[PDB]
Symmetry: C2
Subunit: 438 residues, 2 copies
Amino acid sequence: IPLKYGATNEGKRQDPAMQKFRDNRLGAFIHWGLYAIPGGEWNGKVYGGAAEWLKSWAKVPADEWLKLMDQWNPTKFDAKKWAKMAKEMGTKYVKITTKHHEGFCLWPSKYTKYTVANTPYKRDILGELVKAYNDEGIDVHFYFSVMDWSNPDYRYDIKSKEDSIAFSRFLEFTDNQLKELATRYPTVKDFWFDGTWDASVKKNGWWTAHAEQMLKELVPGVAINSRLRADDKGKRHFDSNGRLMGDYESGYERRLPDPVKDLKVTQWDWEACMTIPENQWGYHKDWSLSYVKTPIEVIDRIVHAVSMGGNMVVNFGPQADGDFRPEEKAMATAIGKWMNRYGKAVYACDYAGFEKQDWGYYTRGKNDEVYMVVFNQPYSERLIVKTPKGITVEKATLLTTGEDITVVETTRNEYNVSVPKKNPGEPYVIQLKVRAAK
Amino acid sequence: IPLKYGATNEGKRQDPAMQKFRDNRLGAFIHWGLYAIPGGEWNGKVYGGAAEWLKSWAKVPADEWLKLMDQWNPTKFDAKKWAKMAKEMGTKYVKITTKHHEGFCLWPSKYTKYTVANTPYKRDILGELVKAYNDEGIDVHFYFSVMDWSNPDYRYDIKSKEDSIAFSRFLEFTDNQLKELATRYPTVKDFWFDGTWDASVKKNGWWTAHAEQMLKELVPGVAINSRLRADDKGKRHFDSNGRLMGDYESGYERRLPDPVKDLKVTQWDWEACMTIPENQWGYHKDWSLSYVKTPIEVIDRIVHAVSMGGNMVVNFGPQADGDFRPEEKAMATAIGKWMNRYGKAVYACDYAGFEKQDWGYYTRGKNDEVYMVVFNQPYSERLIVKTPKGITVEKATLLTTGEDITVVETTRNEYNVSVPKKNPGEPYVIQLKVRAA
Ligand SMILES: C[C@@H]1O/C(=N\OC(=O)Nc2ccccc2)[C@@H](O)[C@H](O)[C@@H]1O
Ligand SMILES: C[C@@H]1O/C(=N\OC(=O)Nc2ccccc2)[C@@H](O)[C@H](O)[C@@H]1O
């Protein structure tokens, strides 16, 4: 099908900027906005829904919601501390909410009064974060919500002549903010779009293709996520020729691809994001309301992503005062101790092409290292490895100690790899040397 | 498709005899015959192939092979010590080679001279084992090879009038031995046929249906394996309508059914068999030539079978002297030590209807117990349980202790059934209380 506004990449991008986005592998997400103030409570009622949607849950008028700017004073905010927290965690990039659905900008936009500038704190939070993260060697990605609850020219659908004209004004406004972010903060490496699912955006595929090109023209090598993009026909993420639009698929949140049934995902770049609670992105005061993931449950999902050729981003919702809740400091600390030991099987790794086994995941390094990441320790003391046609295992090594690991052939294309003599007592890595028959 | 010699069961038999066959779940195989004497070596060459096929590997003439009878003298043999070893192991049934391809009979058959009777030992080994196993409360099943290298009336195909005349004589001989086993040893619970794959048997489907019928008449509630059976069109195991013949499917000697892709096996009774080495059933003197399974690799396979509504039989190949090699005594000892702790999860258990998880297998007790048989201990300290649509986990208990196990709900239809407060330190069992509505 001829499309003017469909996909622009033939397979994965291999330019250095995309290779860096991919090699980074582990990200953090920051959700910070006016929603951190009520933290899921409005007018004495606590709402179970995602805190950053509280304006919706509590049916708050825009005027009353955005009045929260008068209370915005994150006195314990310290962009250097935040960047050290991310660096200690082992995050290679941070994705920041520049503007959520609420419409409150974390940078002093000249296109709205609903920004950091018009609060008691006054400071350009986005700018302080970009510089602090960048000083730590950490890449910065901008989340941006097209849907904007603060602009009455937004429309969910086009059902009239006045909807058409208002939505045209809305797209001009959106272009102004996007160009302003690209120009103010040229170290930006990615635009992660949200609030682009409505019938209104679907009917403006041309506009989604325009925003992608506009930002690519302003920011050499910038990445753009698939959630932005609709084609000529208003088909999202993948065009009507089934090709991926944008630079990477960003449709995975809180259910990762099946390691046996979804090997299709290894054909394109992709990024999963995840919450620590079941479904809280912004600060919610009461994490007793849903299940809260442990560090290992989070590390399992990071390795799972990389094992299938994808990035993983772990969300944080900072407190209204500018500090991180205890649960989130414990998470970043725990992930960071594990990444310092075992990160060689995450950073710059990818799909290995081996059949999934029960003990954990395989990942593949740039020089054909095959890492076994063991999450489930067999009582048998043998890790089953089934090799693809023509692949043999020549050696196994415990990554953290360098100790040689016994490898025994059990049948054609199957080995037992021995567990370490001493139980590592957490998820661990055995590095395989393998050979391809010519 | 209209069939006279297709399936005789509609779904699973549920008479007490089949319920016993199924509840037993854990079997032992015994491969014992003349092949135990050479143990895979013939004229100074050790053959790497299955030792019970040595006659075929070394191309031994029947006359020369069957002369091994002259050396058959297992003076270390004691059926009571065999029946005790099987009892310690937690085996509920024993499948015994009455006659393997070589055609040497472990019972004094009237229809051939190639029997224990015509050896120095003289004694009815089969009858001795039947009594010893039965007195320890162990069911006894008869392996029987229709293909018989001792009888020149055997044919692989029927391509001449002489082929027809000879094979007809061979089927008469086969019926005689089958009738003789069923009458001499009426405690027999099952006949597990082998040597039935040749065009000669496939083209005589009527006969396979006759041997099943004849044995079911002589032995009330006897089981008959799928391997015997060919229908009217020569379709084996499953008839041309896709319906299982005999009382259970006998396969998965190479690989067990896949826990995700082959849930279809839960629809019929089935039994897997396995070797401890990669492919040795009869005694082979050199177990260094292939990989030898550890006890936990064997218990993994047993639990896998029951988790998919199947039986598992672990093979033993006794030495020519009538004793068992050190590796087989260690295996039997270890399987029993584990089965005494955790056997509630195996005996009289079946498919649980739960989505397979990485840490191990579900089995279902007769009263809706759900056992998590944990082989792969998560560092997370959380065992993921996705329940089917309309099931909840009310509690969890370390089977060996009484100790209660924290269940946490995580999403709709998912839990972190906690691991036991203390790590059972081997494949272990946590028991779940479920509830539907
Ligand atoms: C990154 C997160 O994502 C969102 N929305 O994304 C989706 O709705 N994703 C989605 C929905 C259905 C299927 C797949 C993805 C936001 O509304 C949320 O507040 C947060 O910023
Ligand atoms: C029980 C064992 O089984 C045999 N044959 O069985 C099979 O080959 N079984 C099989 C093969 C393919 C698919 C399913 C079952 C015999 O030749 C062997 O000596 C041993 O007695």
